């Protein structure tokens, strides 16, 4: 069946958290370990920062607007609906597990991103969401 809005929200959160993790590694290498720039807050002066992200589900493309709240939660609006999502990525055993609350509903999954595809493995099932290629990298 076609994936719901909530699964797309979880996938977007997972991708953002991965970007944060790479930022953490690059910070680990550098001299300026404690610089505020290394934070993934997305803070702007007197404005709230919003990302227009594009995720590919099945044969239909879906656009998600992710607003970076000051508290660290994310306000993702897909179409008419708006969802408040807070999550973190932590390692169970050898495996990256995303724990995420969307609109106050908490869910646990295994997150594997290889190439474009993002794989959420959970008790309900597996959801695959594709990051579109910039198509200038061919």
């Amino acid at each position: 069946k076609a994936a719901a809005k909530e699964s797309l929200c979880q996938a977007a959160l997972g991708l953002i958290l991965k970007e944060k993790a790479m930022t953490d590694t690059f910070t680990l290498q550098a001299h300026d370990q404690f610089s505020p720039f290394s934070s993934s807050s997305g803070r702007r002066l007197n404005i709230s920062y919003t990302r227009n992200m594009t995720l590919k589900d099945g044969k239909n493309n879906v656009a998600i607007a992710v607003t970076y709240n000051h508290d660290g939660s994310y306000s993702m609006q897909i179409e008419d609906k708006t969802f408040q999502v807070l999550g973190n990525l932590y390692s169970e055993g050898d495996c990256t597990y995303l724990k995420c609350s969307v609109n106050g509903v908490a869910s646990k999954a295994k997150l594997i991103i290889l190439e474009n595809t993002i794989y959420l493995f959970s008790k309900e099932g597996s959801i695959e969401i594709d990051i579109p290629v910039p198509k200038y990298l061919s």
Binding site: I16, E19, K20, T23, F26, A30, H31, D32, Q33, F34, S35, P36, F37, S38, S39, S40, S41, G42, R43, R44, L45, N46, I47, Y49, R51, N52, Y68, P134, Y136, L137
Partner: protein
């Protein structure tokens, strides 16, 4: 060994106090107004030009910035209020240009992007001033510059203010050349039309990226170093170029783990309020912003009207100098001593200005105060450590010079939404002018009437009141931005981080007039 405890500043304010309630109300109103105005400026040139810009397929400048910087990195925008009601009938949001500091490929860079929506990206005089300020910041802090050129050339109806003079348009190119000579990367991305007078920017740059849709430039002129299909591709190419820069950050100061302040920052609203007549202890602010609320005061009981000490912000060491009353001889001497000490140990300096007006005291023997403030002025001017100024209250007269105003080239200068800046208080200027005219016309034997006294006084009062507004001062580029107090700490962190890119070099002092 780093285990011994240190006393912390700050006290819990009285939330029940009526004074706190009223101050909170006023300051929150000011901040809400600031946020609303910033949103309106963010909207840009207008729906008309925005739709036209989108129809041409080009991205909006803010989207360009969002895609350019690292994912989730904070972006420090500067001078969001340039041109705010500066020109009589023309609305120029953001000055027609967007300048800020952001992290690209793990490197702090200064990003300068023309806004095509506002008057086709033409260059108003304020736009030139904003760009020159950004280039000056990048030169001083040794930051790579990235230009997102979508320009329209000088605004012809105002050419006399844009083209000819030293700090006019040509200085832009001058700066570019100089920053290329000192090995500071210049990257230009021609995301708009390559109109007359615009090709100079790509030609001066070290590296170019040109969006496909002159054609002669990429194929034959060879100005193009890279050639991109559209905006997204150009931004990706820019990130790749920045990576290929071969640069590594060199820091030369001791670092410690960072720790949050012990008190919430929003309490500042209650402490400061919007009335300059009431006063407050700067130690409250210092407790709210510094790491762990830990502060080591220096010469606490001498020159009590000035508060100087050492602290850490996000782990970096800082020397803090702030006003707590009317400046005096002892305060000036303490400040000079502290500045010398900080320069010797290579520690960044942070000034907080809350200059108090002279309406309270008629004379204050300006001669001695001047004789001592001159020493402090010289010491501040000759200093070479990074200096950041923050105006949390009034700023009047030579005290502004003494506390490192714009003339003394602080690396950054911010003001709170409740500041006031002018040469004197309005009523004092009115009295001075009235006395001058009265004495003169008495000298020539002419009679001075009280109606004439009011006639001189009132326009001066209104004019000084109007010119002291923070929005008036930030419309011109007299400060790098108006910041919500609740965010102050964060901003300072970013600023200081950027200031650490340049190496700190030794300070040379003039003759200390003893």
């Amino acid at each position: 060994y780093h285990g011994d405890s240190v006393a912390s500043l700050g006290t819990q304010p009285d939330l029940g106090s009526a004074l706190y309630q009223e101050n909170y109300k006023q300051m929150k109103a000011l901040v809400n107004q600031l946020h609303e105005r910033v949103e309106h400026i963010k909207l840009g040139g207008g729906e008309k030009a925005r739709a036209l810009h989108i129809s041409r397929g080009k991205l909006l400048p803010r989207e360009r910035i969002d895609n350019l910087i690292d994912p989730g990195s904070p972006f420090l925008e500067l001078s969001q209020f340039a041109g705010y009601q500066l020109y009589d009938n023309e609305e120029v949001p953001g000055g027609g240009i967007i300048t800020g500091i952001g992290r690209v490929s793990g490197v702090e860079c200064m990003i300068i992007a023309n806004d095509a929506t506002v008057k086709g990206g033409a260059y108003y005089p304020v736009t030139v001033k904003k760009q020159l300020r950004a280039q000056e910041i990048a030169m001083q802090n040794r930051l790579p510059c990235i230009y997102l050129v979508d320009s329209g050339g000088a605004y012809l109806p105002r050419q006399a203010d844009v083209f000819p003079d030293r700090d006019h348009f040509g200085r832009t190119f001058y700066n570019q050349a100089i920053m290329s000579s000192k090995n500071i990367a210049q990257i230009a991305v021609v995301m708009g039309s390559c109109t007359a007078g615009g090709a100079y920017v790509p030609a001066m740059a070290d590296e170019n990226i040109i969006v496909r849709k002159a054609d002669l430039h990429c194929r034959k002129s060879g100005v193009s170093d890279h050639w991109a299909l559209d905006d997204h591709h150009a931004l990706h190419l820019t990130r790749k170029v920045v990576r290929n820069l071969n640069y590594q950050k060199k820091l030369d100061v001791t670092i410690e783990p960072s720790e949050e302040p012990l008190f919430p920052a929003d309490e500042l609203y209650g402490i400061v309020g919007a009335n300059l007549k009431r006063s407050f202890d700067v130690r409250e602010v210092i407790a709210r912003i510094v790491d762990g609320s830990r502060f080591t005061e220096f010469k606490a009981f001498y020159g009590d009207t000035l508060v100087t000490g050492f602290a850490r912000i996000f782990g970096y060491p800082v020397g803090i100098v702030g006003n707590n009353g009317v400046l005096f001889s002892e305060s000036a001497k303490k400040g000079t001593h502290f500045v010398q000490l900080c320069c010797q140990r290579n520690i960044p300096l942070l000034f907080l200005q809350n200059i108090t007006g002279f309406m309270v005291g008629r004379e204050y023997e300006a001669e001695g105060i001047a004789k001592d403030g001159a020493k402090m002025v010289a010491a501040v001017a000759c200093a070479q450590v990074p200096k950041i100024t923050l105006i949390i209250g009034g700023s009047y007269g030579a005290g502004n010079y003494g506390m490192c105003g714009r003339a003394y080239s602080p690396r950054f200068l911010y003001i709170w939404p409740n500041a006031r800046i002018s040469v004197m208080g309005g009523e004092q200027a009115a009295n001075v002018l009235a006395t001058i005219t009265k004495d003169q016309r008495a000298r020539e034997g002419k009679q001075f009437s009280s109606a004439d006294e009011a006639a001189l006084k009132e326009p001066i009062i209104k004019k000084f009141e109007e010119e002291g507004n923070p929005y008036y001062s930030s419309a011109r580029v007299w400060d790098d931005g108006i910041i919500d107090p609740a965010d102050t700490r964060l901003v300072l962190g970013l600023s200081f981080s950027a200031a650490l890119n340049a190496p700190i070099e030794k300070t040379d002092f003039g003759i200390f007039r003893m």
